[PDB]
Structure 1
């Protein structure tokens, strides 16, 4: 017989659940005969069978090949940790990627017009038909090509020994007063500013709020294992821009943040977003600001006021822009390893394992598409990661300081003595003397390729150089200057009049909201009289209704006093808007034909026709309206919130 040799292998065949779905044969009736396996796993002494007339040796012959087959799949590809995603596959994958993995698939918001604000515009002659559309979506056929055109690529060639020279740079701007101090935050500070409707991962069913409401302990798990050193089932989810699941966990300082978003948004599970944030809150939100020149916490109206205070100190100043062609897909793995080392400098000793583990996942990122198509990302930064704004910024300044010093020979220590730098994620610029700025302008497009951050096509391979202050571009705005009553000057954030009217009149699937929008726009665009007069005309409607709260800002009490609180001047005090700069930004209106010759005066007459009746009328907040209407506006106490 052969059973004494069959008991040998049985005490080696892997365990399994005793399944009665078929025939579970004996540890000895195998050597009987005609009982050959079709599966291996033992139920404390059984396997499958087939009644296939096998010889007492043909049984052992087959079974030992399954044990060889099991000791093989168990004990490559798809990462050294991400191997779990193979289970969730069911179909073969059509994505046609040439530079990264693609193992199959898994089982798988219209924008509307503002009633009040839009009606106001049409009444003056503004043709909304001739205005840019600012919320278009995209087809999935177009979406699939977007991944092949932008995302699937081998990590760019970062020059030998570069990430040492980048640490050489960070060593200068390090903050020893904060070294090894950061810690996890309590659930209250994290929850304070959080969007209760944050998007959920592909395998998730509840959103950021419900995760907080019910399974707050499940997030505490992800935090523990990561802090202990265990691999977690890290996945990211990929959706196109303006998809119903493109939702920000934090507050955007303007409608421009969602605008400098890439076509392809990658975000981890909502439970994972909170796990990272309840820990790294001090870095990701950048609660103390550490990356020099990071303006993500700065509000829009002072962004250029703060800068002109530095531009006015250089004997002959110039500015240079960072146009990194699609920055998010330009991040090598040594980069994530660098930001990892940075995060360890300011975080406590207990939390390094959290940083060590999480970074390992962020290098080999498995990303599930909207239709189920799963791909493996060759590094790069997911645009929806918690570390995006924080990490990208630190990466921008370290690269751009390197590129500046490398093109000009200025030591890394002596950088602040010859230049100032401002960034926001990947967008930013850099101010210095005319002499130095030209070197970094020409040699820059080269040195930046060497680092792996390729500039755009540009002109003659020279970076964008701003010679006069008001030619700077930052956060999709440009500096425009206003002159107040008391003859002072101050720069406000400027933009194209069409691009503002487009973003102001549209929604995304409510008079209170219409007013909070008009106030939020007045803080930034009171320099544009066509827009100031619109905002006053909407705010002066239905003064009973308190304003909304879902937009960037809103007001508590009297808006003309809230404006005073944040701008440092009353809207009445706006005496003159810069002559030349207001031409350039109004010009897009005439080329598109969005206004008429009579539009400028017609908007003004409606304000004068409103605030001429005896009393205290909002529209009188305009300097000229009040000027020809005789009255003034006396506002009570008002404040600004978000």
Structure 2
């Protein structure tokens, strides 16, 4: 009768190991009665008890008491600052006001805009879209709330994990390794590194130069860092903490969409540019996943291809479901033991000569001095700094390993049999697995407690059950969800869907210090490659791309086109924009609801936007807008593309 109160309490219990020498009882058995708990240390949702004719509610107060004693005995031990971190105390000037209760705040070192895209935003307002009703995106955070986010998210002890967990995860990894690559990775040349790197990658708190300036002038400083790490010598490793969307919140690398920024923590933490180059030059093959050795890693997968790729798998099951990975604030849940596990996997693939390098870097990452923009210093215990070069690889491998383990331990499938039973996909902590429905439902109901014990608590959901998709287009991944379209050649395919209100908001605004038609047409094109299923988005893009046919698109955003944008679309999408005859009617109604709830459009909006495209397309000539099938069928005019190619930006 009171079994949900016990499932709750078992998620506040310290994770323990298998006690095969006493009775290990589930939350169900406890809600029955005549079971008296003898310790609060939980293992696969079970604790140690002895039958002793006790009332069920009596046994709850005892578990609650054992939990409350255990917490007031592991409070907050003042931890020894490692010697290799001592230098930061030598930079302290004033005393701290972070008021951290779980990490050292050893003081404070000396002190050291959302705007509209004018053309895109005009096209929206002309057809009656109310911009001030759209959701705000890319919000900045002041210093008072910045320090509060530190206190809320970062200022915590390392998660307790199941004893022996990381040996199991290494067992899972042994079922997934690629032995033809073992001990084979070496550092890359400067030239290869310089190809794939944003030269405006941010400088650390004590750095003045950005990535490109350091490449042009201080390569010796980077090789000096590499040398010291190679031999096992400490470096002055620190990370800098800035709020999301700050000036220094810059991606070293091309991102597959704005969803990567959306998923960043509120507190961004990154090593120095010199230090980031050092790690990247040596660990390139691992951090960039070249080749991909993480199963199901979609980090390199274009957003316009991902769901077609997944549907292929979904079709091979006889009753597939998809179970979502939904860890709470993943980066704050990464433990020292997690990092050492990833250190061990890296050592598998890297040549022996880099193992001391990896050991020493990993040691620096387990206790990280972090300097805030305003000078406040805290000493982070474990966790992931979002700007670390290893964030995508290191999180993706840890996510895969932890999710396979949790799935296998809930269902009974041996680790070496996971690949005959389920398919997995990850982007850092984001992802899901597809499997047959009964396995999927099993995993979904037991995964929450197994994942809490493995140190990755899940977001608190309706009945402590992991989210299950029972139809393909209910999957969520990379902030998007599948939507089917119909082409004029009697085929169908999937595109990345999301709320129309969200797309408008992201398309309409930017953070700027770059505000010009060149940038906006690059945005319009980048969005057309993803959202051409959405007729409102499709037509705003065509209108924007019709502006100043002689100005070329900018290269600072996700994609751009060389030559004809309509032909560039067909190059990567595989059909002509003109061949899209139908978007799935049910899914589109779902993704359009918030337009009506927020009042971001009116009953005329679609008509006015269609009427604007028609008015432009009837005129004699060659008009981009006539690539829209319904516009062309009303103007009587077709568009004849010239040559054109899609490319990545920066």
Any gaps of 5 or more consecutive residues in structure 1? none
Q: Contact between 1:35 and 1:51, CA under 8 Å: does it hold in 2?
A: yes
C-alpha distance 319-221 of structure 1, shift in aligned 2 (>3 A)? same
SS at match of 2:425: strand
- Name the structure 1 match of 2:415: 412
Question: Does residue 1:158 correspond to 2:161, yes or no?
Answer: yes
**1:632 CA drift (Å):** 1.1
Calculate the aligned-residue CA RMSD, in Å: 18.8
Q: Is the 8 A contact 1:109 1:244 kept in 2?
A: no
What do the CA deviations read for 1:143-167 (whole angstroms, capped 9, x no partner)? 1111111101111111011100000
Please give the secondary structure, in 1, of the residue aligned with 2:42.
coil
**Offset of 1:614 from its aligned partner?**
1.8
Aligned equivalents of 2:108, 2:527: Cα separation in 1 = 44
1:159-216 residue CA offsets vs partner (Å, 9 max, x unmatched): 0111000000000110011111111011111111211111111111111111111111
CA gap 1:23/1:382 in 2 versus in 1, 3 angstroms: closer
Quickly say closer, same or farther: Cα 1:487–1:34, change in 2 above 3 A: closer
Q: How many Å separate the matches in 2 of 1:586 and 1:4?
A: 37
Distance 1:570 1:379, change over 3 A: same
Stretch moving more, 105-114 or 279-288: 105-114
Deviation per CA, 1:34-83: give whole Å up to 9, x if none: 99999999999999999999999999999999999999999993223111
Gaps of 5+ in 2: none
> Which one is further off, 199-208 or 1-10?
1-10
Q: 1:373 to 1:435 in 2, by over 3 A?
A: same
Change (3 A) 1:611 1:180: same
Deviations along 1:61-110, one digit per CA (max 9) or x if unpaired, are 99999999999999993223111111101111111111111100100191
Q: Which whole-Å CA distance do the structure 2 matches of 1:289 and 1:351 have between them?
A: 20
Check if 1:205 corresponds to 2:208.
yes
Change (3 A) 1:607 1:54: closer
Cα deviation, residue 631, structure 1: 1.5
CA apart distance, 1:629: 1.1
Q: Higher strand share goes to which structure? A: 2
Equivalent position SS for 1:41: strand
> Equivalents in 1 of 2:58, 2:531: separation in Å?
85
Q: Which has the larger radius of gyration?
A: 1
Q: Is the 8 A contact 1:109 1:243 kept in 2?
A: no
Change (3 A) 1:174 1:49: closer
Higher mean C-alpha deviation, range 382-391 or range 93-102: 93-102
Q: Evaluate the alpha carbon distance shift between residue 225 and residue 624 of structure 1 in structure 2; reply closer, same or farther with a 3 A threshold.
A: same
SS at match of 1:217: helix
1:211-245 deviation digits (Å, cap 9, x = unpaired): 11111110010011101110110000101111111
Cα contact 2:24–2:47 (8 A) shared by 1: yes
Higher mean C-alpha deviation, range 103-112 or range 474-483: 103-112
The alignment's TM-score, normalised by the length of structure 1, stands at 0.88
Residues 32 and 208 of structure 1, relative CA distance in 2, 3 Å threshold: same
Partner of residue 571, structure 1: 577
Of residues 127, 131, 141, the one that matches 2:130 is: 127
Counterpart CA distance in 2 for 1:358 and 1:305 is 39
Give the conservation status (yes or no) of the 8 Å contact 2:16–2:162.
no
* Cα shift at 1:9: 64
Change (3 A) 1:631 1:103: same
Residue-pair matches, total = 642
Deviations 1:280-319 (A, max 9, x none): 1111111211100111100100110100000011000000
Distance of 2:239 and 2:189 partners within structure 1: 26
Cα deviation digits, residues 242-277 of structure 1 (max 9, x gap): 111100000110011000000001101110000000
Could you tell me how far apart the structure 2 residues matched to 1:489 and 1:46 are? 48
